[PDB]
Amino acid sequence: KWTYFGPDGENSWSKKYPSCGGLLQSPIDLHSDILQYDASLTPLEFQGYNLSANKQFLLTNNGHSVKLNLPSDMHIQGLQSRYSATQLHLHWGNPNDPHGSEHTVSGQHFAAELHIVHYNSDLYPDASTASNKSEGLAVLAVLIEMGSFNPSYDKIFSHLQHVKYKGQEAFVPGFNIEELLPERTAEYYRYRGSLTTPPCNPTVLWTVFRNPVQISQEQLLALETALYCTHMDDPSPREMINNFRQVQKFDERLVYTSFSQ
Amino acid sequence: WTYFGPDGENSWSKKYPSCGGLLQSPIDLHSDILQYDASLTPLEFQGYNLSANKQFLLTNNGHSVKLNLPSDMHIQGLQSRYSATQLHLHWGNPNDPHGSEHTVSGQHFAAELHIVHYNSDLYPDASTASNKSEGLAVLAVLIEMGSFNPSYDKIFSHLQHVKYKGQEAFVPGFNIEELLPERTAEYYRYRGSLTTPPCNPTVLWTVFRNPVQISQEQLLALETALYCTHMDDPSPREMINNFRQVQKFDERLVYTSFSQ
Ligand SMILES: CCOc1c(F)c(S(N)(=O)=O)c(F)c(NC2CCCCCCC2)c1S(=O)(=O)CCCO
Ligand SMILES: CCOc1c(F)c(S(N)(=O)=O)c(F)c(NC2CCCCCCC2)c1S(=O)(=O)CCCO
Ligand SMILES: [Zn+2]
Ligand SMILES: [Zn+2]
């Protein structure tokens, strides 16, 4: 029954989900005082991201975001373990305030944020098992700015009107997921953190790319207006907007960067 | 409650329900939510020139350093008289010296001074006012690093004597208006809450537009002088990062006394 607004909003998550009040919480504000170059943060390699256009992948409204299920033959290499994809999802604001990224950079929110969730498939048989374990998850984050129309993100957004309500599912033809990534993926921030939603487990290695991507105002408006947190028959409908957590205290962490300037 | 660890701000709402309710402060002050309001005329600070023949109690309460203020000190200009009760500060730490509560265009200032007042027309004391309608008014001064500030040193010169939780010192009266910035006629105004437990949504906030300056050495003293633990605690903890994160603030405006 957790939400991002009202009595069950983010200041209340810890009442039911103790880790939301614990250490290592995400998201965070990426600002100069807490950044440190780390020359060991070499490029990631994206393996299996080119999904076949003749296959299809399940898109679901889970009542909190829209998520696309991804095949476990999709993985990121370059980490000390291989991590296999499990799903991607987004966070966004609202039509009157299109400023709903989770991470901020030097105190500024971006329009929206894409997260590609992966689990340690060297160590664990599935993402749920990995999720409460040491080194379990790795999330890639792409900051999204209002800008030009993005045909690659539209491969997801063109299906919004078919997953309007909680529990609804649709199929999306495969496409190359690396088209959702920005320029210069070798430039990223890296830190230890958590899931940004309940249960807030502190088991996520975050990689936030330095450069944002653009999607148009019209794409953001569709994202911000198409979806409901509630089921199709709910007498108290709730729009799915502003589904981002506020930034969290650092608690002595640093954020390591693969770029020195 | 604490500002860190398991009893930190995401857990306040367990014991202090209002911390998860409406009208929470602090917030980011940014151009999209600002609206000029011609009704926001200058405040008058009466009784702020405190007798130098009087002393005023400075305490480390384990959360901040607070100075008790007399009720004959009051703001004029609001519908009711609001009488002073105390002032205190929020700050960051030497590795990240950006610990204001309010942000401006997403940016923290170095520190923030708050002068708390209560509606003495309606209520007999601040504690009684704190959970009631129109109960509280806080004045907020944003602090940045710059020139040595003699006025802030009238407080900061006493910090050594309030190093540990529970410790107190007497401060001789001085003109509190000296702690306020230039052009106090320019301010942001909104209805919000206490930024600490119990987080009651009973605060009329006035955040002055213009910051004050203090020296690099004054800010480092604030950030390093105090612990949040008792003297005899075998596990001492420095008092740093004593600010709440900004809160969501949707479908609302912050009113400004300035348009330019
Ligand atoms: C609003 C989106 O919700 C997130 C979420 F924000 C994050 S994040 N931002 O990457 O921390 C998520 F990782 C997930 N998905 C998970 C997939 C791994 C499966 C284990 C349990 C939950 C995490 C999900 S979610 O699966 O969409 C909902 C999980 C509720 O526990
Ligand atoms: C870290 C400083 O704590 C604040 C504080 F942050 C605020 S603020 N930022 O102005 O909201 C406060 F107002 C207070 N003091 C108030 C005095 C009025 C008396 C009744 C309740 C406490 C609030 C205090 S406090 O009195 O120092 C601690 C209150 C714990 O209930
Ligand atoms: Zn996410
Ligand atoms: Zn305060």
Is B137:B25 a contact under the CB 8 Å cutoff? Answer: no
Buried b (16+ CB within 10 A) or exposed e, A167-187: ebebebebbebeebbbeebee
Binding-site residues of B for Zn(2+), please?
88, 90, 114
Instruction: Give every CB contact of residue B38 below 8 A, 6+ residues apart in sequence.
Output: none
CB count in 10 Å sphere of residue B203: 23
**d(CA B86, ligand 4 centre) in Å:** 10
Q: Determine the residue among B4, B7, B9, B10 to mutate to test chain A binding: the one whose Cβ has the most chain A Cβ atoms within 10 Å.
A: B10
- Rounded distance, CA B144 to CA B139, Å? 17
Residue of A nearest to B248 (CA): A246
Query: What whole-number distance in Å separates Cα of residue A220 and Cα of residue B195?
Result: 33
CA A112 – CA A27 distance, rounded (Å): 13
Residue of B nearest to A98 (CA): B32
Domains in chain A, CATH or no CATH each: 1-260 (3.10.200.10)
Give one word for B202, left, alpha or beta, with left for phi > 0 and alpha for psi -120 to 50.
Answer: alpha
Q: Are A74 and A51 in contact (CB under 8 A)?
A: yes
* CA-B86 nearest atom, ligand 2: 17
Give A18's contacts (C-beta < 8 A, 6+ positions apart).
none
Residues 6+ apart with CB under 8 A from B234: none
Q: How many angstroms separate the CA atoms of B189 and B210, rounded?
A: 14
* Site residues for ligand 1, CB cut-off 6 Å: A 62, 64-65, 67, 86-87, 89, 115, 117, 127-128, 131, 139, 195-198, 243
**Amino acid found at A211:** N
- DSSP letter at B107 equals E
Q: Which of B13, B32, B98 is facing A11, going by the closest CB pair?
A: B13
Q: Select the residue of B11, B97, B248 nearest A21 (Cβ to Cβ).
A: B11
User: What's this structure's resolution in Å?
Assistant: 1.1
Assigned token pair, B87: 């002032």
Tokens of residue B211, six digits: 């910051």
The verdict on whether A64 is a catalytic residue reads yes
What gap in Å lies between CA B200 and CA B136, rounded to an integer? Answer: 10
Contacts for B43 with CB less than 8 Å, ≥ 6 apart: B75, B76, B77, B78, B139, B184, B187, B206
Strand duo B203-208 + B136-145: pairing: parallel
Query: To test ligand 1's pocket by mutation, which of A115, A195, A246 has the most ligand atoms within 8 angstroms of CB?
Result: A195
CA A117 to CA A139: how far, in whole Å?
Answer: 5
CA of B139 from ligand 4 middle (Å) equals: 9
Q: Within chain B, where are the H helices? A: 12-15, 126-129, 150-156, 216-225
| A159 is annotated as contributing to ligand binding | no
User: B128 CB contacts (<8 Å, ≥6 apart)?
Assistant: none
Q: Which ligand is nearest to the CA of B111?
A: 4
**Experimental technique:** X-ray
Q: Which of B63, B74, B108, B158 is labelled catalytic?
A: B63
